[PDB]
Amino acid sequence: KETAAAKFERQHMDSSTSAASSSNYCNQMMKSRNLTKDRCKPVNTFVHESLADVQAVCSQKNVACKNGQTNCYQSYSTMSITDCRETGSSKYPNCAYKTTQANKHIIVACEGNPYVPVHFDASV
Numbered sequence: 001k002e003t004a005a006a007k008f009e010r011q012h013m014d015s016s017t018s019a020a021s022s023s024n025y026c027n028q029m030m031k032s033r034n035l036t037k038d039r040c041k042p043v044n045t046f047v048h049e050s051l052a053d054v055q056a057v058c059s060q061k062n063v064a065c066k067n068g069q070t071n072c073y074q075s076y077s078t079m080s081i082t083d084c085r086e087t088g089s090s091k092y093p094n095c096a097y098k099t100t101q102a103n104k105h106i107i108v109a110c111e112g113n114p115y116v117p118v119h120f121d122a123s124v
C-alpha cells in the first residue's frame with residue numbers, strides 16, 4: 001500500500017499556501033486528503049513549508065517520540081502550520097473542524113532511505 005513517507009505527505013504537507021486563508025480550510029483539506037472517508041479523523045496538522053524544509057527536520061533536534069521511540073526530531077525553526085480539530089457537534093459523515101493557524105516547531109518521526117518524516121508527533 002501507500003508508504004509511510006507518502007501517507008505523511010497526504011496527511012500533513014500543504015506547500016500550496018503560506019497559511020490557512022479561510023475558517024473552512026480544515027473542512028475542505030480533511031475531505032480532499034481522504035481523512036473523513038470512513039470516520040472523521042479528530043485531530044490533524046498541515047505544514048505550510050517546502051517538502052525540502054520539512055524533510056530537513058530529520059537532521060535537526062533528535063528527541064523522544066510520544067510512543068518512546070528515539071527517531072523523532074524537532075524543527076529548529078517555527079513553521080507555518082494549521083491545527084484541524086473536530087468540533088464538539090461534528091457527526092460523520094458531516095465532519096466539521098475548527099481551523100487554527102499558528103507558527104510552531106514541529107516534531108516528526110523519521111525513517112527509511114531517504115530518511116524522511118513518516119509520523120507527525122506534535123507541534124510545540
Ligand SMILES: Nc1ncnc2c1ncn2[C@@H]1O[C@H](COP(=O)(O)O)[C@@H](O)[C@H]1O
Nearest residue numbers: 004065067069071109110111118119120
Ligand atoms: N515514533 C513513532 N510514532 C508513531 N508512528 C511512527 C513512529 N516512527 C515511525 N512511525 C510510523 O508512522 C506511521 C503513523 O503515523 P501517523 O499516521 O501520523 O500517526 C506508521 O506508518 C509508523 O510506522
